[PDB]
Amino acid sequence: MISGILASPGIAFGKALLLKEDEIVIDRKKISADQVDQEVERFLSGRAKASAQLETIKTKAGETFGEEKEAIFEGHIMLLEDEELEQEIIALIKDKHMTADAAAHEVIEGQASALEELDDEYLKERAADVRDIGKRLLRNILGLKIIDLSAIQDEVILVAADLTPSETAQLNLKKVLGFITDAGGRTSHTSIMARSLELPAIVGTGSVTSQVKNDDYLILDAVNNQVYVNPTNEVIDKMRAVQEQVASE
């Protein structure tokens, strides 16, 4: 069966919300000096947008967990608005005729890679949080569609290979029912939430994302540590009684 680490006990019912991501296609075409000036505005003014987006996520981190976590996202903006990283991006766009999408990808390529060369498991995890800041910056230049997990409209379960502080900082715990992630870390951020929020959850699912799909009907037991996919009405009716018999006790 599906054995995870079990974060907290409980039973919930809901449709599976799988978090997939659309692959981004960067154009490696060389532009002309007549399109370079336009890229700077699309890149400079673009930052005006990404700055407003990450900024809005910053307050959701302080209004959701408390200004105590705003210090982490506060630095995430200084790096994005870094006046130094901007002069380097600009040059490439003007010197190597690179697209704001391509050039910006170059600097972000050494930021994450260079962080792996550091001798600190901490700055390393920042590498993952940094790639997220770059990927978002890209979808902002192409104005690509973004998933709005901050405004769900249907109560469902949350399933994902893993969730980064940002996803957890914008997640709306107003219509959520539970969290399931492929993180087998006895100290995974997901668990810290499921643990502090006392809600029931699991994280060592491992590869449930390779056996489940979005909209799939699931039933979390968090009692025997097992996920049931499309069970018979005989097991549901039997669990609907016991489970609800608990809330009634």
Burial of residue 111, with CB atoms counted within 10 A of its CB: 0-12 exposed, 13-18 middle, 19 or more buried: middle
Do residues 17 and 159 make contact, with C-beta atoms less than 8 angstroms apart? yes
Q: Are strands 217-220 and 12-18 parallel, antiparallel or unpaired?
A: antiparallel
Q: How many residues does the chain have?
A: 249
8: left (phi over 0), alpha (psi -120 to 50) or beta: beta
Element (H, E) at 105: helix 100-116
- Experimental technique behind these coordinates: NMR
Residue 189 among the catalytic residues: yes
What is the rounded distance in angstroms from the CA atom of residue 152 to the CA atom of residue 169? 14
CA distance 143 to 227: 37
- Strand, coil or helix: what is 151? coil
Phi and psi dihedrals of 204, rounded to 5? -85, 35
Query: Which residue in 76, 97, 105, 189 is the catalytic one?
Result: 189
**Rounded CA gap, 229 and 15, in Å?**
10
What distance in Å separates the CA atoms of residue 138 and residue 173, rounded to the nearest whole number? Answer: 27
Are 239 and 219 a contacting pair, CB within 8 Å?
yes
Helical pair 100-116 and 83-95, crossing angle rounded to 10 deg: 130
CA distance 67 to 60: 9
d(CA 201, CA 193): 9
The answer to whether the beta carbons of residues 2 and 227 sit under 8 Å apart is yes
What distance in Å separates the CA atoms of residue 4 and residue 91, rounded to the nearest whole number?
49
Query: What domains lie within the chain, and their CATH numbers?
Result: 3-20+147-249 (3.50.30.10), 21-146 (1.10.274.10)
